[PDB]
Subunit: 252 residues, 4 copies
């Protein structure tokens, strides 16, 4: 009921955090368009959830995104919320091991893909007085070791969220972001598998939070539903979903 | 349904933001104890809302607060959430017009009252894996003119929220705060009435937000219900409910 | 030369960070009044440093502070900078082990002592277009375990710094703060000595910073001299002197 | 004397903030390499300042930057500090008026140019235990209207500064940034000239700060010299040089 009659697009919604956000919006009564560059997870999610449908779309391809928006409007008649979740964290890379071209590529996904869908969706969000939710990262705010390009892309997303919030406020379109800390997802598991001791890597990630565990996609999803449906006086905020990782002293 | 079977105490719940928080929790299915030093608003709210009851309590009086907690447990058998909302903003005061004793008095209400109820409630919150929500202010983070004591008390509340979150995390008790900006309440109206041109004061307060309006108690209430019921990986966060007042350049 | 002809008051200047700030200002060419409630360290510093003199003053005693200001003006004819450094970190205390009265006492030293000297000094700082520097703490911003009252007092100091900066900006008086992280001082050493394994406590404190060491009083002192003498467009800022402790993930 | 015997590279040092930073480091005793894509200002500065020399270099051209570093080492034998100041603020642009390609171009200058010089300089900074200073912007932290691409690039710079600080801390290389607010420069003047009422635009920019004026390049320069020469326990910090623009409520 909380978001009934509304239409939501979630990028990277085929697995991980994006899938948890898809589920949370379906559970709120919304119709959800799952956007993903990979077919496997998103196609299964459409079969599983009445009210969710899957559209293949690579957010780095401008024409893919144009088609995502026009098909969303053609099939559902309105657009109320865009969740820019698609993005990627590379394996650990020392600064001297990064490249300008790798940096540009990560910018294309983590930042410009968010920019392009938001831009194409804003005319419809203005009609609906809808809202934008960007999935950034805690490490955009506090930094991270061996991740100069990734951290830079999320710093940009969080800052862009505030600029856009200023620009769209006279039209009643809110723009917010969520900064998750360690969330247990296939990406986290993939990255842990590259480590010498994956179980040690995972235990270390759990202990980075005062709460002693990592977060869940469903917890990010509930934050997104709050921002969309109940946060009518929130715009340009950075909602931390981190288990307290930013608090207090730790072993650095 | 979202917070059914839960018991919530809201201090200063007789009017303004506190009353909006009371209403939001009742609408979520919780039973609510309205604490206030004034009888008029809170007594009427109890008559109006099934599931809410009023207990007279001045949060600066330690024995009042002891009785608030013990009566809450006696009457409802559990305690899941404490919302420390009671507090006051004095009229504008130049720094040379403040006094150490006025500062101590405002500290007693805005900070130590929050500290005392939280302390007395924590043994019951640990049993329920409940949570604490402190109502701070945006001006604790960014400052405000002619309000040195007030700003200082809210800086302390926001910082204390993070310290307590660290201490209580091994027990599964989350501690968060909400920082509202300009919310249209009887306090805001009272303060505007002291100005030479109250309508000019109010128009200026509306235009301090990119959204062009002040916030509502119900919007603070929805943020509080989110933190209590759906933010299980959030602890020690400062949730801004400000309409974007902190964003961008303005006339300073 | 950088602060020649200027007169600076440093509270708690008899040892630790305060003594490092005294030394830095003397080395810059300023005359320095060392305020401390203890005679031993401050008296020796006056004998050691030409241009520094010691005045016994407990910043929690309003009449002590009145005399500190009037004696500073009587002896040196002007007042350009007040460094509010006096303050104390109690031993670790679980929240249920704190008291309202202990909290009030720490507020008297860490917050109201800073407030009282600043208030009495502002008429002279206005004449000189001088400035105020408050020594807060990183843990006011990010929290700390087993330190609810301390963290709250430094949250208040940092917020008060911004409020005062707003109030005094039309008079050209800047108000800034420094937030040190772990600085190796007699206080740090005293607190480490209370731990079961003091050498383990100290090694843990060094490793809380990416730089792998604690900071020095002289490094806080150089930050203070910068704010006083060269930061003419800085007001209301929080200058972090923390070795990066706030950056990245750590063992929490 | 404060930075005697040291070698500093300042990008965009031919005018504006960069020229003020060049002057501040020369006045501190350092030798300075002025990098700029434009010959006019930087060539004159070399003639004016003994100890400063001009090297033509476009920071978006990787081979220009390779030559800048190798010529700095060839001519001066060491490299102690890199100030990444080159960058540009476009005219106001509504979000629907921006393009992905314009965004990529601004990223090339404001972000990747900083990344490329830092990367090529780090082997020499490690030898000297030198430091990096990035010139970001206050609007990366708080947002700005009609500047989505610009704000995003400075959000990235500030975040990248913290990531790099973490990576380089075990080598004793500090990485910090300065976030100026409104600084009176040829860029500010150029942008004001595009407005309908340039004098009204400028008066509005002065009043955006509680101090009632814009900042000077020399004030940014003094902050940079502090970070390089005296801030040995500061790494990953964001030093605000804004006149208090971020403080308090304003007309938004
Ligand atoms: N996992 C964490 O701890 C964590 C923490 C903070 C932020 N984040 C952010 O959350 C988001 C999701 O992370 P995750 O852990 O769920 O990752 P994930 O790898 O598990 O899932 C990402 C999904 O996005 C899709 N995707 C990738 N590139 C795409 C593209 N070009 N177009 C469309 N879809 C694309 C993938 O196919 C996948 O289904 C990312 O923005 C990530 O940076 C994650
Ligand atoms: N109104 C705003 O714009 C605004 C903005 C930011 C923060 N806040 C904070 O929100 C809270 C509520 O503000 P409001 O505008 O609703 O104020 P309000 O004056 O309208 O309501 C406050 C309520 O608290 C009660 N109260 C006061 N002192 C008390 C005490 N000692 N014990 C018990 N109850 C007591 C009052 O009787 C009243 O019912 C305060 O903490 C305030 O600082 C308000
Ligand atoms: N040491 C750290 O790691 C650290 C970190 C962050 C902030 N701080 C802050 O720095 C300041 C100094 O800390 P420190 O480690 O140098 O402490 P310290 O105990 O070594 O020195 C404090 C000095 O202040 C004096 N003092 C105490 N109470 C006083 C009073 N009422 N009136 C006058 N003088 C008084 C003491 O006699 C002593 O000379 C404090 O405000 C502290 O909170 C310290
Ligand atoms: N002026 C302000 O209010 C303000 C505020 C915050 C941040 N900043 C930042 O400060 C920096 C300098 O700003 P400014 O106002 O002095 O600008 P400016 O235009 O006056 O000076 C910039 C200088 O950089 C040079 N430059 C530009 N592109 C270059 C390139 N590709 N390679 C080499 N040199 C290049 C220009 O030729 C010029 O000499 C920028 O990073 C800007 O974003 C400025
Ligand atoms: O933002 C991320 C992210 F995407 C990940 F996949 C991580 F493992 C992590 F630690 C982060 F901070
Ligand atoms: O925190 C407050 C508050 F309580 C008020 F009543 C206000 F009017 C205001 F502007 C604030 F920022
Ligand atoms: O602020 C402080 C302080 F004063 C101390 F003495 C400490 F040991 C510490 F860790 C802090 F964060
Ligand atoms: O960062 C900048 C900048 F570069 C400019 F040129 C400006 F005019 C301004 F307002 C900013 F915030
Ligand atoms: Na379906
Ligand atoms: Na009732
Ligand atoms: Na002396
Ligand atoms: Na020269």
């Amino acid at each position: 009921t909380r978001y009934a009659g509304k239409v939501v697009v979630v990028t990277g919604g085929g697995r991980g955090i994006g899938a948890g956000i898809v589920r949370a919006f379906v559970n709120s009564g919304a119709r959800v368009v799952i956007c993903d560059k990979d077919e496997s997870g998103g196609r299964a999610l459409e079969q599983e959830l009445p009210g969710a449908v899957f559209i293949l779309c690579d957010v780095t391809q401008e024409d893919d995104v144009k088609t995502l928006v026009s098909e969303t409007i053609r099939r559902f008649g309105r657009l109320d919320c865009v969740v820019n979740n698609a993005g990627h964290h590379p394996p650990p890379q020392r600064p001297e091991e990064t490249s300008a071209q790798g940096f540009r590529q990560l910018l294309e996904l983590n930042l410009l893909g968010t920019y392009t869908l938001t831009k194409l969706a804003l005319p419809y969000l203005r009609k609906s007085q809808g809202n934008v939710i960007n999935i950034s990262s805690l490490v955009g705010a506090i930094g991270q070791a061996q991740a100069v390009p990734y951290v830079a892309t999320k710093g940009a997303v969080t800052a862009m969220t505030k600029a856009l919030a200023l620009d769209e406020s006279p039209y009643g379109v809110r723009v917010n972001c969520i900064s998750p800390g360690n969330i247990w997802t296939p990406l986290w598991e993939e990255l842990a598998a590259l480590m010498p001791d994956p179980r040690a890597s995972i235990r270390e990630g759990m202990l980075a939070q005062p709460l002693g565990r990592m977060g869940q996609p469903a917890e990010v999803g509930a934050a997104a539903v709050f921002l969309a449906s109940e946060a009518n006086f929130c715009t340009g905020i950075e909602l931390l979903v981190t288990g307290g990782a930013e608090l207090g002293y730790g072993c650095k």
